[PDB]
Structure 1
């Protein structure tokens, strides 16, 4: 099937008037609920520095990098 005759058919726009706004909303809710900070470990604007750590947190060990990061992200 050709391309431009698909996107001009009304059956294409019956399907994609629901699926495209539902994915755009679901991407919006991935940020609005704060889930993307917890999945990827990105700091929220509150939590670049904590009350104990006023410095920039760096990992200085290779094999305890997972445990050193858990101590830097506890607050």
Structure 2
């Protein structure tokens, strides 16, 4: 994680933003309602 320091410029960062919310829910609602 190089680049420059953050403050209030980086939001979703395009990719890995909606997929991050689809990968977490793919291991929480699954490992709870049918593990």
TM-score by length of 2: 0.52
Structure number having the greater helix percentage: 1
Give unmatched runs, 5+ long, in structure 2.
none
What is the aligned length? 31
Looking at CA atoms only, which structure, 1 or 2, has the larger radius of gyration? 1
Give the CA RMSD over aligned residues.
1.8
| Runs of 4+ residues over 4 Å off in structure 1 | none
Which residue of structure 2 lines up, in the alignment, with residue 19 of structure 1? 20
Whose RCO is larger (CA < 8 A, sep 6+)? 1
